[PDB]
Design a protein around this ligand. Structure first.
Ligand SMILES: [Cl-]
Ligand SMILES: [Cl-]
Ligand SMILES: [Cl-]
Ligand SMILES: [Cl-]
Ligand SMILES: [Mg+2]
Ligand SMILES: [Zn+2]
Ligand SMILES: [Zn+2]
Lengths: 30, 21, 30, 21, 30, 21, 30, 21, 30, 21, 30, 21
């Protein structure tokens, strides 16, 4: 695997692929 | 957080698993 | 705004757009 | 719930809004 | 709802979600 | 227009409905 | 270029790519 | 039309080009 | 990481994320 | 192969990794 | 058709649409 | 390459076909 800048929507899409079934949280203000 | 860790800096897929439920 | 049929990453994109800086939790069933 | 509802039948952006923090 | 920079493809995807069935137009030169 | 209003500045989902048919 | 099966936001993305700075109208049936 | 054709059966990028302004 | 159901551009996005700066070949059957 | 497997049934990110250069 | 900056994921999505069935390669280090 | 040709500069869909298999 690798390291890239993931901004905006791209970040939540990466989390979707990574977490899938498990779900995730997206909390910018933290 | 997540935005600091990934958009402005860079992160791995493995750090992203930190935010899985 | 209209109704939407929304699967996979599309759901999570729509949540990014709707929630924004407030964030969200993606909580699929099982 | 939502994820199933939006995908299996349909949902409104107002319903999605129930998932924001 | 919220306020974010929507550029390129992201703008047309947002319009799709927003307008759906209704359709929309995307006219950069205006 | 739309690009000025959203990419360079910011816009709401509600302003985006201005471009629905 | 090839034929494409294109639904939802995918159609509208493909229109963004093909039309560019010329823009386009997204005109679904009903 | 196009939206149905590209999604229900297939379409070419040349056909899509009919939708640009 | 989890299993993923991945079609169309989704497969190729997942390959971009997984492969990164190493790159990849997208080699569909026929 | 992969493209069919990931789409028709499922696949893991570890399997995808077989496609990187 | 037209000319736009295609970066990150957007580049591989454009290649997908362009190449389709034919497949493609994505090699950043070249 | 491809990244130089498209992200930092700009490219056409036709240049992109250079990278089809
Ligand atoms: Cl972006
Ligand atoms: Cl972008
Ligand atoms: Cl899809
Ligand atoms: Cl981007
Ligand atoms: Mg997408
Ligand atoms: Zn982007
Ligand atoms: Zn999709």
């Amino acid at each position: 695997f690798v390291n890239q800048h993931l901004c905006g929507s791209h970040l939540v899409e990466a989390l979707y692929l990574v977490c899938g079934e498990r779900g995730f949280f997206y909390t910018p203000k933290t | 957080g997540i935005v600091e860790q990934c958009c402005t800096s860079i992160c791995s897929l493995y750090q992203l698993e930190n935010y899985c439920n």
